[PDB]
Structure 1
Amino acid sequence: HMESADLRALAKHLYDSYIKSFPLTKAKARAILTGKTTDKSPFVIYDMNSLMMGEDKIKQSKEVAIRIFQGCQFRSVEAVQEITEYAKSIPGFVNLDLNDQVTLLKYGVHEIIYTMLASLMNKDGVLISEGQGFMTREFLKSLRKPFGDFMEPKFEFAVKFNALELDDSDLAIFIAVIILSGDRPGLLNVKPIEDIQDNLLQALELQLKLNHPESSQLFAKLLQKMTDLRQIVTEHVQLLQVIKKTETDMSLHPLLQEIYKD
């Protein structure tokens, strides 16, 4: 248990670090998607010709679906780096056993990537290149082989997750809660992780009540989204395994390679 003044302090600390760690916030993403601006408008990629212009406008040689896939891997690697930097700011995290720090990151980064990818998404597509571009859901769904099925589950989650109307100050605490999960396989000291997560959960609960006072049981509704998050991470790895069987000419970043091994 924490005094509410301490829970607010924790929320502000976490929101402050999130702003420092993640260059493209949900608030900026919404300003870009929601228009009414001329200085923030993205170039829209919806087909092969517009993709080819995007290389000139927004600014590898292989099949289109490969190039896009590789682009995502590059950005996922960046997200892992941003997420790693943020986790170190979570009070208590860097004091955990070093093996547990690694373990929490390995199983946590993908659930967080999907969570924050939703910020960049609406039902028609997703922001890319730090919001300079926007690639349509339709174009992603039409990519060949297994690559077309890759992107769409992300979109089905995002439309549902986005209906919660969370802002960055909410997401910063939620993301912290995800990292400090005591049920990750192979954890050596579950209890101090659970202790940190209890404080974070208290902070999330008070934050959601203050920031969405008319939004009954939003706390419980947000935690249920773990279900959706878990399900997509599993579909994602199962699709990766197919690609690792069909496209043996293709390599993953060492960081992603290590995250997925077991």
Structure 2
Amino acid sequence: PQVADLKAFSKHIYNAYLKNFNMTKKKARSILTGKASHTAPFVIHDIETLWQAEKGLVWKQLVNGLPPYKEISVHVFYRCQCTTVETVRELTEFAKSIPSFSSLFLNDQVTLLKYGVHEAIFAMLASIVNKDGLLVANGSGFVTREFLRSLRKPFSDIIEPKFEFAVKFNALELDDSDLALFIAAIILCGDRPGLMNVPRVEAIQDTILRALEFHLQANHPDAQYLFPKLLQKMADLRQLVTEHAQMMQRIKKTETETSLHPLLQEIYKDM
């Protein structure tokens, strides 16, 4: 019974994922691996190609509406911020499409998103990343890791750790059906500070985790220790976000000309 019930639950979360996220890992890898297609991403690897891309690629956030221009490294950071906020919106709609998340009182929904979205973002980031760079502009561009490394501190430093995580995470070869459960588990997390109904979120979390371990025995029958490995990645993501927040505190302190989106301010407010 348990195995069957959890299979149904996993399908419902997968559908939530497919309904709400702009890009799947399946579509991202097909673009990254240069699979047969009539278009390839424009490669952004330096100042000239960045400029060409702001001229020639289609961006969800129009450039005129980014904060006023400061310099190349900051401009890149503003593009990072734009896409981060866009992903928070997707994650919010994904979570809302899970009935046991929507049943929670709205204040607990906010607390879970507040403390979970960055972990979920850096996990789902891996889907559009390879060792050489990442997709941007809905897959119409590819920004090289080497170019991101070339930006001045503090902006290069806040980027490279996410590549290090992503390449290791991609070696586990999760697909979108795995990620739907993994991200649902990240968000529905009973450990978040200030939660009102902890036992309820703990129970949901546990249900998602049992669903996940069964999902992996079916979908990845030959992959030994894959479930405990993913529990460790959940732990790892907390540390990655702790780091990230500390780096953001330093950008707020030392980069006073750099504009920080007010939603992200509300997220770091307490951390």
TM-score class, shorter-chain normalisation, is: over 0.9
* Equivalent AA in structure 1 for residue 117 of structure 2: V
1:178 maps onto 2:186 in alignment: yes
Give the match's secondary structure for 2:126.
helix
Query: What is the match of residue 247 of structure 2?
Result: 239
User: How far apart are the structure 1 equivalents of 2:227 and 2:153?
Assistant: 39
Comparing 226-235 with 80-89, greater Cα deviation is found at 226-235
* Equivalent AA in structure 1 for residue 204 of structure 2: I
- Displacement of 1:97 in angstroms is 2.5
Query: What is the match of residue 37 of structure 2?
Result: 38
Change (3 A) 1:139 1:191: same
Query: What is the match of residue 199 of structure 2?
Result: 191
The TM-score with structure 1 as length reference comes to 0.96
- Displacement of 1:109 in angstroms is 0.3
Query: What is the match of residue 68 of structure 1?
Result: 76
Unaligned runs of 5+ in 1: none
User: How far apart are the structure 2 equivalents of 1:126 and 1:98?
Assistant: 34
- Displacement of 1:199 in angstroms is 1.2
- Displacement of 1:77 in angstroms is 0.5
Change (3 A) 1:19 1:29: same
What are the Cα deviations for residues 156-208 of structure 1, in whole angstroms up to 9, with x where unaligned? 00011001000000000111111111111111211111111111111101111
1:44-63 correspondence runs (5 A):
44-59=43-58, 60-63=68-71
- Displacement of 1:249 in angstroms is 2.2
Match among 90, 106, 119 for residue 98 of structure 1 = 106
The TM-score with structure 2 as length reference comes to 0.93
- Displacement of 1:65 in angstroms is 0.5
Query: What is the match of residue 118 of structure 1?
Result: 126
User: How far apart are the structure 1 equivalents of 2:45 and 2:215?
Assistant: 38
What are the Cα deviations for residues 28-61 of structure 1, in whole angstroms up to 9, with x where unaligned? 0000001132334101111111111112221453
Q: Percent identity over the alignment? A: 64
Aligned-residue CA RMSD (Å)? 1.2
Query: What is the match of residue 224 of structure 2?
Result: 216
User: How far apart are the structure 2 equivalents of 1:202 and 1:184?
Assistant: 20
Give the match's secondary structure for 1:127.
strand
What are the Cα deviations for residues 6-47 of structure 1, in whole angstroms up to 9, with x where unaligned? 111111111111011101110000000011323341011111
Give the match's secondary structure for 1:92.
helix
1:84 maps onto 2:83 in alignment: no
1:163-174 correspondence runs (5 A):
163-174=171-182
Give the match's secondary structure for 1:164.
coil
- Displacement of 1:98 in angstroms is 2.3
Match among 129, 144, 148 for residue 152 of structure 2 = 144
The alignment covers a number of residue pairs equal to 261
Give the match's secondary structure for 1:44.
strand
Unaligned runs of 5+ in 2: 59-67
* Equivalent AA in structure 1 for residue 17 of structure 2: Y
